[PDB]
């Protein structure tokens, strides 16, 4: 996260770290949506151009964390993966269309002050909240500039009008994406960066005070560049796939 700040304790209890076993290292962010299911970006797991094709046993998820590098004894929980599910129409060849994947955990995780699932939007919450100028929140342990943070970083960013997103990049954007960030000379900045992929873009509903995951950190060109914006997987647009996977595997 660029131009963010340290998260408060328990501020994002759905935040998940994707962790490589050998060598031990952060891979990506992710999010907790139930005691057995974790949401992330497909390109965190499968991206042939970078020779990235992880299998279940390559990976752990670490839940309830704050420090990036410490083993947070009596706070974090470390889970093994039962199964990885990648969207069948994930387009890694072209533009990361449908950049979404689910990971089912071997055992249910116990909730705590530091571990708690985020909500997924329904059509009414999506239509109400996903509007240009409305702000969401992105969290992660990724790079601080285009080094690395001691603890989880947070930044609040406005959703951008779709024509501005389109005109900011030569990459083809789809209805399964949205973009967010400040326009140049608006007086504020901030962006996700490498290592934040797979983490959640969340919004707090003013109707019921619940946090909803509207997006997944997906792609960008540089980090925090003027006139560029971060792109996010549109979670509601892929909700039917999410439900199909969960309503057929557990």
């Amino acid at each position: 996260i660029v131009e963010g700040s340290d998260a408060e304790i328990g501020m994002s209890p759905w935040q998940v770290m994707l962790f490589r076993k050998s060598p031990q290292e952060l891979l990506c962010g992710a999010s907790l949506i139930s005691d057995r299911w974790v949401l992330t970006a497909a390109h965190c797991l499968l991206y042939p151009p970078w020779d990235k094709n992880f299998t279940e046993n390559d990976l752990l998820v670490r839940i309830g964390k704050h420090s990036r590098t410490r083993y947070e004894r009596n706070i974090e929980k470390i889970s093994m993966l039962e199964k990885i599910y990648i969207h069948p129409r994930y387009n890694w060849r072209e533009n990361l269309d449908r950049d979404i994947a689910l990971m089912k955990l071997k055992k249910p995780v116990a909730f705590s002050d530091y571990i708690h699932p985020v909500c997924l939007p329904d059509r009414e919450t999506a239509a109400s909240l996903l509007q240009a100028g409305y702000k969401g929140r992105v969290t992660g342990w990724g790079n601080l500039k285009e080094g690395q943070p001691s603890v989880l970083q947070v930044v609040n960013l406005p959703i951008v009008e779709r024509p501005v997103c389109k005109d900011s990049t030569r990459i083809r954007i789809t209805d399964n994406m949205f973009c967010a960030g400040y326009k140049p000379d608006e007086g504020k900045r901030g962006d996700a960066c490498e290592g934040d992929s797979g983490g959640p873009f969340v919004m707090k509903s003013p109707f019921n005070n619940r946090w909803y995951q509207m997006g997944i950190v997906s792609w960008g060109e540089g980090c925090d560049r003027d006139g560029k914006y971060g792109f996010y997987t549109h979670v509601f647009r892929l909700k039917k796939w999410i439900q199909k996977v969960i309503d057929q595997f557990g």
Binding site: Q24, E25, L26, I78, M80
Partner: peptide, 11 residues
């Protein structure tokens, strides 16, 4: 940089 995690998980 990363503190070693319990071997119970890595097995």
């Amino acid at each position: 940089d990363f503190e070693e995690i319990p071997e119970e998980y890595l097995q």
